[PDB]
From a paper:
Pyruvate kinase (PYK) is the last enzyme in this pathway that catalyzes the production of pyruvate from phosphoenolpyruvate (PEP) and plays a crucial role in controlling carbon flux; however, while S. pneumoniae PYK (SpPYK) is indispensable for growth, surprisingly little is known about its functional properties. The overall structure of SpPYK, which consists of four protomers with three domains, shares the structural organization of archetypal PYKs. PYKs require divalent cations for activity, and they are either K+-dependent or K+-independent depending on the active site residue being a Glu or Lys, respectively. This residue is Glu93 in SpPYK, and we found that both Mg2+ and K+ are necessary for the proper function of SpPYK. In contrast, only a modest activation effect was observed upon G6P addition, and the kinetic profile remained sigmoidal. These results demonstrate that FBP is the primary allosteric activator of SpPYK.
Our substrate-bound structures provide the first detailed look into the active site of a prokaryotic PYK containing the physiologically relevant substrate PEP and cations required for catalytic activity. The PEP phosphate group interacts with Arg54 and Lys248, which are ideally positioned to facilitate the phosphoryl transfer reaction in coordination with Mg2+ and K+. The binding of PEP and cations did not significantly alter the active site structure, which led us to wonder whether inter-protomer interactions between A domain residues are involved in the allosteric activation mechanism. The C-C interface rearrangement was less pronounced in the PEP- or oxalate-only structure compared to the FBP-bound structures, suggesting a limited effect of substrate binding at the active site in inducing this conformational change.
Author numbering:
A (entry chain B), D (entry chain B): 21 to 521
B (entry chain A), C (entry chain A): 1 to 501
The structure:
C-alpha cells in the first residue's frame, strides 16, 4: 500500500548526534555535530514516510538551521528518496522575558494581583512580568482594560483590570493557579497590535532560507492577503517564484480574511496551537473542517498540524484521543499531517513518524466510504474540470492501480490531486524544483524523467516508469492524463486507459 | 442543422420516369426506364435527408430490383453523397389469390357465411376464397376452429366456425362489412403455420441481393434466433460478413423471443403494419417503446416503420396525428424512421422525406429535456463504458460542437452513438463497406479518410476533416475518441478535448 | 382497471334519435328529439369512460344546446354516474360566406388569381369570396400585402398580392389545387385583427350556459389574461365562482402570453386544430409537450384535443398513428383527452370513446417507467408540498391501492393529482359543484359524502367509502390525506397509512 | 439550543462529601457520607447535561453502590430533571495480585526475565507475579507459548517464552521498560480463556442492581449472543424486561460476532480502553466508525466511551486531541458519549461534563453538512420506514423546531431517533420506565403525560406540552408522529405538520 497522505516532520536535536552523544546526555551541546551519524538517523525518518522537513526559525540561529539543511541533503542520499524543505517564520511572537537571579519559573494563585511591563530590554521579576515583543514594539496603547494575557499555551490567564500611564504597565489578576516560566509564549486575544506585514527579522530569516534552498515557507500569524504578498515579493525578487507559500491561520483576523488569504497563498497550515488560545477551544474542530474544505475547493494544499501525537514526546505509544485526532484529519481530507515536538525534541522521533504513517494508511482505507471531501460539488463547465471528473469516475468505476501524469509545471498533478482519486498518482516531471514542490500534494508520488518527443512516446514513458518503480505489473489498469503537447503551456486535455502489458 | 435521426426511404416507381412519363400517366408500364432523369429524382430525396434506400422484394422481380439499385448508384454520384442499401425479404407472406373473370374485389356484409380454400394454384370466387401461401404450404392442419383470418390490413375479419375434411376448406362468418380484393395480405393470429426457418425463394432473393451489393437485410416475420442465423450463414458463405441483419418483429413469437433475436441480429425494425394485426392494436405503442429501449441497451440500431406519414401517399400535408407519431419515435430514441408507401408509389415522395426530416430535427431539439433513453442505466465496470460515459458527460458539461472518431471496424462510432451525446458524431473510416454500414446509426456522419501513422496524426486528421467538411470553425470545441492504436484490434481507450485552431 | 386519464367527449346529433331515426337516415332533421332513447345512447358513452361532455357553441342555437344538456342530465340518472358539463365559446371565428345559386363548393388550381371581399352581409361567388367575420368586423385595414388566407383546416392557401382601396378587397393567388366550400373556417396567421376581449355573442352564449348549469368554460382564441378575466367577471357577477375556465391556446399571441394566461385560468385546452394552421405544422408536438409541463407545474388541468382519433368519424378502427398520438398524450402527462368530431357527428361515437379509454389505460401502465412529468422538479419549502411529496413517496415505496382524501374546496385532491401518484385518488366531498368540478383532474374519482365530526371519524369515513365503492378490500393499504380540520379553510397538513380491516 | 447527543457520566467519590471533606483531603474515607451535600453536587452534573449515571461494579461493594443510587434519586429531586441509571458489570477481569510487604509497584527493564503465577489466592513478588483471575479460574492450559501478557492499560508487555508444568507458571521476558503496580488490569490477546457466559459474581451484581432499580446494564467482555441472553434471562425472571442491555465490545471475539450481538442487545458500548489493548491500537478508529454505523442501522443505541477527556482528571482544560476525539464521535453519529474517571475520581467533575456538552452542541451544528450517518441507505418498503422518511424529509425541507411523539412503548421515538431528524424530538409517554429508558436515544427529550382519548386530543396534548416546556412558541412549526390509536400496540402510521398557535 502507498501512504497517500503527506507527512511534515519538524527537525531538531532529537535526531542530531554530537561526539557519539544523543539529546538528553549531559554536555551534549558542548560536543560538535557528527553530520554522517545524524543523516543516517534522518534517513530512517524519510524511510518511515516523512515527505517534508520543517525548519522552525523560532528556535536556532542561521548557522544551526543551515547546517541541519546540509545534513538532510546527505540524508536524502542515504535513503535515495528526495523530500521537500519547509521554512517556518517566527513572526510576531510575544514571549516572557528572562527572570532576575536565573529563577526558571514562579507559581501564582487565583485572586493574586501583579503587573505586566510593556518596556522592552528589561528582565522579569515575580512582582512584574517583562514581555519580549518581536521587533521591540510598545503594545501599551494596543491592549485595553478587560483584555486577557495568556502564558504557556493559554494554560494561565491574567485579566487586565487597570493600566498605569506613569510606568506604562498593566495591572492584572491571576484567573487560575499556574506557573509563569521564562521564554514561554504570550497571547492577547481580540487585539490588533500593529505588527508590520513584514518585520525585519522575518525578511532576514526568509532571505537566508531562500539562499540555502527551500521548497516552501509557512508564514506565521497571517492576518490578511497583504502579509502573504509581502513574502511573495521577496520570492520573485530573489528568482525563487517556485517557492510555495502556506498561510498559517493562527488567529481571528486570519479566519475573518480566510477567503482572500487562500486566493493569495499556495496552501494553508492549520496551526491548532496558537488558534486554540486565540479562539474558543471547543471550536477548533469546526474551523479545522471548514478550512480543509475551502482550501481543497481552491485546489491548494492543507496541512493539519500541532499536538497531533503530543504524548509521544515522552511515551512510546500515543493516547486513543491522539490516534482518533490524526485519523479524522485524513477523513476531513487533509493533504498533510505534521509532527512538531514529537520529531524535533522528543525521545521517540522515528516511532512518532511510524505511528503517524500507520494511522494515515488505515484512515485512507476508509476514505472511500467515509471521506468528508466531495469532488461532485465542484464546477464542471471547463475542459480541465470535465477531464479530472472523467479520471475520478474511471477510478470509481474500475480497479485503477495508478493515475500517471506527465507534467512540466505539475499543474495536471495538482488538478487530479484535488479530485482525490481512489488511486495512487505518479507525477512525472522534468525539473527537481517541480518534483520537490509536489511533495505535499495528497496521493502524488513525484518522479523525475526525460520530456516526451510525442503523445505516443508520452504513453510509453508513463507505463515504463510505473512498471520500473514496481507500482504496476502486467494486467494492472492505469490512467494517463496530460496537457498535450506536454512541452507547450496548455492545461489538461487528454486521458488514456491502458492495461499494463 | 444536422439531422441526427436517420431516414430509411422505400424506393419504387413514384420516382422512376418511363419515356418521359411519370407513374400514373397513360401506359407508363409499357415504356422503358429513363435512368438518368430517374436518378435526378432519387438524388433530390438524398439531398432532402434520405440516408438508406429499401428494396422491398415482396413486389418486383430481380431484373426490376437490380435496375433500381443501379439507378441509386448513379443517383449518389449526382448528389455527391453516399447512402446505405437495404434489402427487405418477402418471407412467409399469405395473399388472397386472383379472382375468376378479372374481378378486382367483392363486398360482403356481417353475418354472411362463406369458405376459404387451402388448395394451392386455384383462383378465387366471391363464394370461395383461395389463399396464395408462400412455397405452396397446406395450412388446413395448422389452423383451428375459432381462429380468425384477416384481409387488407386486418380491416375485414373472417371467423373459422367449421372445417370440411372432404374439401380441405374453412367455413367462415364475415364479422364486419368489408371488401376482399385480390393480392391483399392475409393474417392468422395465434397460429404456428410451420413455415421453414429459411424458404427457398428468400435464399435466392438474398443471394441475388448480395451479388448486386447491399449493406443491410431486413428479415420478415422473425420468430426465433434460428431464422436470423440461417441468413447469417449465407452472408458468411458468400464473403458478405459486413452485411448487417435487422430482425423484423412482425408477430407474437417474435415479441416472446425478442431477447434471443436481439443477441442474434445487428438491430431491429419495428414492423407496425403486420404487428398491429398480429397483436392487440392498442398495444403497438407499448411494444414500440419497450423494443427501442432493449435494442439501445444492446448497442444496436432500431428502425420504427409503417404508416409513419400514411396520408402523404394521397395528400401534400400529413395529419397532426402522423406528425405526433414520427415526433415521439425520435423521443423514444429510435435510430431511424422509415417511409414505405409514401416514397415508393405515392404522389409526394420528395415532400414525404422533407416533411419527415423537418419533424426529425424538431424532435431532436427536445431530446435533451424529454428523451426517454437514459445512458446512466448502463453498466460502467469496463473501459469502453467509462470512456463513452466521459464523452457523453463532456457534451453534457460544455458546448461540444462535434465528437470525432477514427474507427477501423466502426466500433467506437456505435459506442458513442449508443450513449446519444448532445453532439453530431463525425465517424472517420478507411473503407466504403464500414462507411455505408454506419449510415443507420443515430447521429453518426460517416466519412472516408486515410489511416493515421500515429496518435498525434490521428488528432491532426480528425480536426482537419471536421474543419474541411464545414462542421466546425476556429474557436469551436470538439471531442476526439478512439481505440489506440487505430490499426490494432483494440476497443475505445482514449479521449481528447481540442479547441479547434 | 381504473382509467386515471379523463375523457372529454363533444356531444351532437350522432347520439340523438329523431322519430326513431338515427342521424344520416332520410329527413332526420324534420323529426323531434326522442329524449329517452337518446339519453340511453349518452348513458353508454359515460359507461364506456366519458367523464365530461362538451357543448360546442360554434354550431347550434340556445334551444338546441339547452335541450342537449337536459338529455345528459337524464343520461346520468340512467348510468347512475355523474359527469362534468363543459361549454366551448364560438369566439372570433372567420368563416366563408354562403354561395349564390346554392352552390356548395368550387375547385381552383395553382397560379389562379381571384379576390376576397371584406364587406359583411354579402354572398360568395366562385370569382369573389365573401368572409363571415364574427360581429361584422371590417378586416381590410388589419391585413397586410404578403399575408396568407387559409381555408378548410389550412388545406388551401391564398396569398394577398394586392389590396383595392376602391372595392375594399384583397387580390389573392391560389397556392395549391383545392376546394373553397361554404361555411368553412378561415385563418390569417401573423395578424392582430382587433376583435374585442369579449364579443357580445360570447357574453350571451356564456350567460345562457351559466343559466342552464355548467362546470367548465373553454374560451376560444385566448390572446391574453384580459380575455380570460372578462369571462371571470361574468362568473363572479352571476354567482358562478365555481365555474373553472380553460384558456384554449389557438394562436401565436396565446403561445407568447401562455405564462400570464396560465396564472389567469383554472387550466388549458391544447387546441391542435387552429394551432396547426396558426403555427408551423411540425412545431405542434413541441408546444403540446411544453404546455402540458407548465400547466402541471401550476397545479392546473390540461386537455389535449382535436384529431386525436380523426379517422373513426368514418371507419370502425383508428390508424396506428392516431393510437400512437393518444398514447403519447398520456405519457406527456395530459390530465384529459378530447374527442370532437368522433362523438358529435361520426358513425362510431361509442367505439371512439371505447377505443380512447382502452389506449388511455394502456398508456397509464407505462406512466411509471416512461412518464415525462417529474414531481421531484417541484419546490419543497412549504407544508402542502412536503405533504404531497410524502404521499407520492408512500405510493412509490409500497403497494398503495388507493389515496383517499376528504376535501371541502377540493384543494387536497388537486394537490395529490398534481404529483401523479402511482395510485387511484378517491376525493370525498360535501357538495355537487365541488364533485363535478374535480371530474377533469387526472386520477381523481369524486364521490359525495357527509362532513366528518372529528379526525378519527374522517379516517373511518375514508376507509368505509373506499370499501363500499369496491375500490379496496380487506388487507389492502390506503393513504388518507387532508387539511385538518376539514371544515376550517386550511391547506393539507395530515397523512395516515391504513391497512384496510 | 438543546444538546441532542446524550452523556453518560460515571459516578464516584469526586462528587461525594464526607464530614464536609472532599476527595483527596486525608482521612476522608473515615468520615460518613453527607447525602444532602453530594446530591447538591450531583444535581450540578445533571444541570451540566449528564443524562445517565454509570455505577461501575468493578470498584465498590453493594453497600457503596446502593447508597450512591439513593443519592442520585435525591439529586433528581433537587435539579427536578430525571436521568437513567446504568449498571456496568465487572465481568471476566484479570488483575495483578497484592505485593508482599505492602510494596505498591516494581520497575523492570527490557530483556529482564520473570515468571507469572497461575495459582490463585497467593500474593505477588518482584520475582513472581500472581494474577487475580475472576472466579478463581486456572488459565495455565488456556494461554500458549509466544502469547503476550499486558499490564496497566497494555503499557507494559511480557512475552511468554516458556511454561513450567512443575509450578504451573509462565516464564516471561520484559518487552519494554515499565512499572507493574498492584490491582492493575491484565490483558492476554488472541486467547479464549473459558470464562462462563455468566459468572456467579456478575449474576449477584445484576440481581442487586435490578433490586435497587436500574434502566440499563452494560455487559463487559461480550464474546457472543449467548453472553447477552444469559443476562436477558435474569431480567425476564425478576420482572425487569424493560431493562435495556448494552453489549460492551471489548475484544476480537466481540468484533467477529458483532452482527449476532447487535441482534441480541438493545445497543452497544464502544469500550475503547479494553479494545485498544486487545486489537491493533491504530485500528480503534476504524472499529468505532463501523460499529456506530451498524448499530444505527439496527435502530439501536451506541455509546462511544473511555478516555474521551482523559487529561481533565488532573487539569481544568482538555487537550486539542481530546476535543477533536469527542467532536468526531458526534460526527460519526454516536447516540451518546461517556466520561469515566473524569467524573468519578478526577479534580474537575463538573467542568468535564460542561466541556463534553459544549463540544457535543458544537459538533451537532456540523451534523447537517458533515454527519457520517445517512438515513437514505435504509430500506423503504414498510409503513414505519416511509413514515419516518417523511418526518426526516419534513425537517430537511422546512424549519421544523420540534418533532413530537406520543408513545406507549417509546417505539415511535426510537424510529424517528434512528433517522436523525434536523430537529429536537419530544417523546411523550405514560410510564416512568419508558421515560427513563429513552434517555440514551439521540435527540429524544422524554416527558411524562396523560394518555390521549382521541387522535384530535393527541394533537392538542402534543402542542400544549411542547409550548408549556418552552420548546416552541407561536409561528413555530412542529411535526406530530404516532401509531394511532396510541393506546393499541400498533407501529407508526400517522404524521401531522402544525403551525403552533
Ligand atoms: Mg503558532
Ligand atoms: Mg410485414
Ligand atoms: Mg378552434
Ligand atoms: Mg473494559
Amino acid at each position: 500500500m502507498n501512504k497517500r497522505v503527506k507527512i511534515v516532520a519538524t527537525l531538531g536535536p532529537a535526531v542530531e548526534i554530537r561526539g557519539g552523544k544523543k539529546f538528553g546526555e549531559d554536555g551534549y551541546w558542548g560536543e560538535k555535530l557528527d553530520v554522517e551519524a545524524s543523516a543516517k538517523n534522518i534517513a530512517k525518518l524519510i524511510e518511515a514516510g516523512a515527505n517534508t522537513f520543517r525548519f522552525n526559525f523560532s528556535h536556532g540561529d542561521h548557522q544551526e538551521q543551515g547546517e541541519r539543511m546540509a545534513t538532510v541533503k546527505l540524508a536524502e542520499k542515504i535513503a535515495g528518496k528526495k523530500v521537500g524543505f519547509l521554512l517556518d517564520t517566527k513572526g510576531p511572537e510575544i514571549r516572557t522575558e528572562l527572570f532576575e537571579g536565573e529563577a526558571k519559573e514562579y507559581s501564582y494563585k487565583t485572586g493574586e494581583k501583579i503587573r505586566v511591563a510593556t518596556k522592552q530590554g528589561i528582565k522579569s521579576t515575580r512582582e512584574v512580568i517583562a514581555l519580549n515583543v518581536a521587533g521591540a514594539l510598545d503594545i501599551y496603547d494596543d491592549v485595553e482594560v478587560g483584555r486577557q494575557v495568556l502564558v504557556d499555551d493559554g494554560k494561565l490567564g491574567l485579566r487586565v483590570v487597570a493600566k498605569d500611564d506613569a510606568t506604562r504597565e498593566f495591572e492584572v489578576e491571576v484567573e487560575n493557579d499556574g506557573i509563569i516560566a521564562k521564554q514561554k509564549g504570550v497571547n492577547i486575544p481580540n487585539t490588533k497590535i500593529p505588527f508590520p506585514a513584514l518585520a525585519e527579522r522575518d525578511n532576514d530569516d526568509i532571505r537566508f532560507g531562500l539562499e540555502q534552498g527551500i521548497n516552501f515557507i509557512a508564514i506565521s500569524f497571517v492576518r490578511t492577503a497583504k502579509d502573504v504578498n509581502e513574502v511573495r515579493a521577496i520570492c520573485e525578487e530573489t528568482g525563487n517564484g517556485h517557492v510555495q507559500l502556506f498561510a498559517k491561520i493562527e488567529n481571528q483576523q486570519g479566519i475573518d480574511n480566510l477567503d482572500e488569504i487562500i486566493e493569495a497563498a499556495d496552501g494553508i497550515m492549520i496551526a491548532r496551537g496558537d488558534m486554540g488560545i486565540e479562539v474558543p477551544f471547543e471550536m477548533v474542530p469546526v474551523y479545522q473542517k471548514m478550512i480543509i474544505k475551502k482550501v481543497n475547493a481552491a485546489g491548494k494544499v492543507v496541512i493539519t498540524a500541532t499536538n497531533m501525537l503530543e504524548t509521544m514526546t515522552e511515551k512510546p505509544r500515543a493516547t486513543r484521543s491522539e490516534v482518533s485526532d490524526v485519523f479524522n484529519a485524513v477523513i476531513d481530507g487533509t493533504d498533510a499531517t505534521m509532527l512538531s515536538g514529537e520529531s524535533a525534541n522528543g525521545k521517540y522521533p522515528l516511532e512518532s513518524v511510524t505511528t503517524m504513517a500507520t494511522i494515515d494508511k488505515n484512515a485512507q482505507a476508509l476514505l472511500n466510504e467515509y471521506g468528508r471531501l466531495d469532488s461532485d460539488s465542484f464546477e464542471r463547465n471547463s475542459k480541465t474540470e470535465v477531464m479530472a471528473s472523467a479520471v475520478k469516475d474511471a477510478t470509481s468505476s474500475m480497479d485503477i492501480k495508478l493515475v500517471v501524469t506527465l507534467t512540466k509545471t505539475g499543474h495536471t498533478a495538482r488538478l487530479i490531486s484535488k479530485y482525490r482519486p481512489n488511486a495512487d498518482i505518479l507525477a512525472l516531471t522534468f525539473d527537481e524544483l517541480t518534483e520537490r514542490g509536489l511533495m505535499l500534494n495528497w496521493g502524488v508520488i513525484p518522479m523525475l524523467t526525460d520530456a516526451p518527443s510525442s503523445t505516443d512516446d508520452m504513453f510509453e514513458i508513463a507505463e515504463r516508469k510505473a512498471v520500473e518503480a514496481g507500482l504496476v505489473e502486467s494486467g494492472d489498469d492505469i490512467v494517463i492524463v496530460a496537457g498535450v503537447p506536454v512541452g507547450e503551456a496548455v492545461r489538461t486535455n487528454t486521458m488514456r486507459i491502458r492495461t499494463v502489458r
